[PDB]
Structures are given as C-alpha cells and as structure tokens.
Amino acid sequence: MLFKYIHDVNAKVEEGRRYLSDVVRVALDKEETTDPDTQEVTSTSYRVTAYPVVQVGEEEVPYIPVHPKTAEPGQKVTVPTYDVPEKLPVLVRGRNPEATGDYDDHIWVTEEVEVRPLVDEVFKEDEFEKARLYYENVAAQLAEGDDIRHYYRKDLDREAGHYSVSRYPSF
C-alpha cells in the first residue's frame, strides 16, 4: 500500500447503500505475478481501490504539528487501524407475519448486505502517473463533500463517431 487516505463522510453519504460506514479508505498498491519456481516476476500492475472500513485496533505514530501548533522532539499520538469488513447492516420497512393488531403490523427490520468496493481500477507497469492522477482525483472528489460520481476512463471506451456501431439500442 504505497498511499493511504482516510476520509470522514457526512450523514447523507453514510445513508447510501454503497457507503455503510462513517469512514472511507482510498489506497494505491502495486501487484506482481511470479513464476512458481522462484521469484522471477512476469508483470507488474498498480491498483486503485476505495473501501468502507471498520476499526480493528490502534497503533503508535509520530505527531505532525500544524502551523498554529508546536510539538515536542519525540511526541507521539495514537491513531486507529482499519480493515475491510464482510457484511454491514441496513434498516428497511417490513411487515410482522405474526401481528395481533393495528399497532404492531408495520415494523423496521435489519438486514445484512454484502460489501463491495467503491472503486477498482488496474493500470499497467507503465503509466504510473495515470494511476497517481486517478487516485488524487478520487481523493479530491471525496473531499468535495459528496459521493464518488466520475468513473470515465478514455482508454477503456468505445470509439466515438462510429455511427454504424453506435446506432444500436443502449438505453
């Protein structure tokens, strides 16, 4: 994990189906494929991902002050660690199969749903600058205060201006 960004989303984002946690993690990582015999690598790729994460522990890190503050030579602060969960709850409207009257017919039920990544992109061994730009754009768009909305990549797209192929239904 070359880069790591922990962002705090607001209540409106936290209520979305894809965002079922109060903290979103954005990271860039490098992957390799090696032959089974030895460490002979065959290819290298960069992956950019965003995940809803949960707290699983704490760790000791150095303290980094900001301009209106001053720090001791060896001051340290504690920060939480995060890990990808498996299922997160959500409340939906439902009905009581064993209701007895008009006051306990409508209820709210809790259902657990599968967690999926928000972003998952793969870049080749070259074009590390493109992966870095994508990571920075995702982080900035999260910092804008809304959901992640833009996913368009020019490399993975159909040719524009090809009328004999774009006339088919897509709606």
Added chain:
Amino acid sequence: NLSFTDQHIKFWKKIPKQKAYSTVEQYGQLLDYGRSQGAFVGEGVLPDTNDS
C-alpha cells in the same frame, strides 16, 4: 531648591492615559491572516479551507 523640578520629567508626560475599570484588563489582537498553504489550484477544483 537644589534638586530637580517637574520640567525634568519627560516620559510620564508623553505616554497616553486611559481609564481603567478593574484590576484585570483584557484585549484581543490579530496575529495572522492564514497559514501559507499555496493558493494555486487546478481548473474546476475546489480550493482548500484556511483559518486566521
């Protein structure tokens, strides 16, 4: 009179005088306009927040 007079007192007569209303007097001051972050942003990008 072989000693000094009131004409030899200089600093006490130049300092401005103000009225005090208690044994503790408070005042506020502005020290800075914001931390120097860098005001150069991209096209269509939201600038960062600053505090004085």
